[PDB]
# Entry
Amino acid sequence: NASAPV
Amino acid sequence: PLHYPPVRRDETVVDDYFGVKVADPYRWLEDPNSEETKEFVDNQEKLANSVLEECELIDKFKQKIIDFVNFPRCGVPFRRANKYFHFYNSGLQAQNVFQMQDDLDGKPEVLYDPNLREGGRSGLSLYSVSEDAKYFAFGIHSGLTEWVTIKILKTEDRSYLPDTLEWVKFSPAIWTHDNKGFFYCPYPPNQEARYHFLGTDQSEDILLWRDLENPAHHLKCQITDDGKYFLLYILDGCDDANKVYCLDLTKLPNGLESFAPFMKLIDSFDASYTAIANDGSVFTFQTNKDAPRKKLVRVDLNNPSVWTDLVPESKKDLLESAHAVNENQLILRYLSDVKHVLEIRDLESGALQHRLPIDIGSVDGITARRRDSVVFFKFTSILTPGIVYQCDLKNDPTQLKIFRESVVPDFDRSEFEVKQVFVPSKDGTKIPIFIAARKGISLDGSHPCEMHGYGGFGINMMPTFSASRIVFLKHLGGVFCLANIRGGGEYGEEWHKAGFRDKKQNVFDDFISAAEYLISSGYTKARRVAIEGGSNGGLLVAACINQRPDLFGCAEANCGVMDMLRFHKFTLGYLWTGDYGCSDKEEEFKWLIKYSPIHNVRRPWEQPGNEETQYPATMILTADHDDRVVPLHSFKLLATMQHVLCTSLEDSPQKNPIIARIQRKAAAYGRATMTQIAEVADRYGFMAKALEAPWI
Ligand SMILES: C[As](C)(=O)[O-]
Ligand SMILES: [Ca+2]
Ligand SMILES: [Ca+2]
# Structure
């Protein structure tokens, strides 16, 4: 559940 | 023009490993609370900031990353009763927000917003909705520790139940179909399996399983789609192997209030078993038993000796996961040469019905249940930010339809391409790698190159979307490589085993050989290659720069495991001895001493013919408070590398900087957008500097 695909 | 701080050595610390004397002059860095260790951190922080201010492209990277990340993201929806639940992020929120809706394209309502709590320092890692859709059980971190507290909200009005469950880590909350409560797996104030009735205090929770005799055994659990069986899985280490205990809930005289009488269907650690479906007592399992590429098997619990292949093991492809869907069907997710293939089959006969091969990238997040006729899943890729696909198996089983589609602002994917090629390793084995770059580039050796890898623990590295990677590609004229080296599980268990324990070194040889290929093919050149990796991937970076520093210009190891002699002594290092060995045993020490990063730092310029070589520019990244990979690993390596290569000599040929980027007041987990961007921007600015690469 990562916040954003950085 | 660089000023390394003084770092005390304790020349009295020496250990004898089976007749071999090993000094540990930086033993004192293993206490993260001593003021010396804090002063160490403060000095390295000062050094790093000093070096990073020389890296003038950080500001430019940071902005382009932000701009490229700033697009809305709807996660894969799942259904409970008549409601649909999914994660959302408008683009640059610290953490994703959990949302609920009555209709798929109806008005979202916010169920829980982690950004309101502690500035969104951490997001939801446990989230679980009851069968009736009335209750949402979720995990909140209290501080920088790994410990979670489980709270429960009513979905109708977003009001909390008084229930508070402490002492939880990674457990999920498994709801019974009566909606009276859920199973979970906490630790005592020796993991346990408990059931919690809604409206009661944690003290009242029913105990289902412990094993005081085997404290290190840990648990996962599950309940069947029909709600009749509770399944408890017991695991040993980070091995892909587990037990299977089944509890039949229909035969309990007084529900769970009685209390346990498990049918121990699998009472050993020989193979992995994951329950996919059942029809009464007839179960379908995914297993790796006699099948390193896995398969589905079927067994009746009333006659548990007899197991029967339903879908046999493929000679070539890993059966990575399986899902019962649309009452009587299966979706199988095969991994074929590191590319996904979905198959649709009959549940009963196991017969193939349809076969959908997938473009380079990754499908995952299939959360549909057996009663659902509409399957959703997520696809991503180097050049594809994120599509949620839908497949309605009832009305249109053949076609995948786009349900949500992310768009990166101001980015034309058609200027770039991604190829998969296979390259030979030292022992002849072919190694798949993915290579991403601008279309039509000249293979003239000129391009800066970033190579990423992991190589361990059965983990499959897939070419997913990274926004900062696009920046690297577009604005640094770069070439990205992802290497599927051994130790992973990409070709099943034999690919895992060929890169672990005594054969760990093959993992490093595979990575080195990928770099050798990228050089010989004309993509890049010696010294213009950057490598990056995290955890076991950090071990990968650090071992490879010890062994072939000549090859690399820049190296970035993230929360890496660098003291392979002592790793097992700390926190949860004991669960990695499956893959690594343990220095407690002589045969295994002999593997480890050879690649253990902190015990293999040597001046490359002191070897014949190698006078012109130095270690690459090296950034070592960690939190000050990592409880998984304790930062003493990263610190001790830094100290060692700094001493051996810099501060032990009056005017050393090691001119490439060696620093640590140290994240303050951070945990291993949960990583807020922005915090995360900051880190990546720092490491890419550094990289651009080390490779002498201009901006575009
Ligand atoms: C968290 As690990 C050391 O298994 O990559
Ligand atoms: Ca400046
Ligand atoms: Ca250089």
Remarks:
- The CA atoms of residues 535 and 560 of chain B lie 4 Å apart.
- Chain B touches chain A through 31 residues (CB under 8 Å).
- Chain B has two domains: 1-71+408-696, 72-407.
- The longest helix of chain B spans residues 35-54.
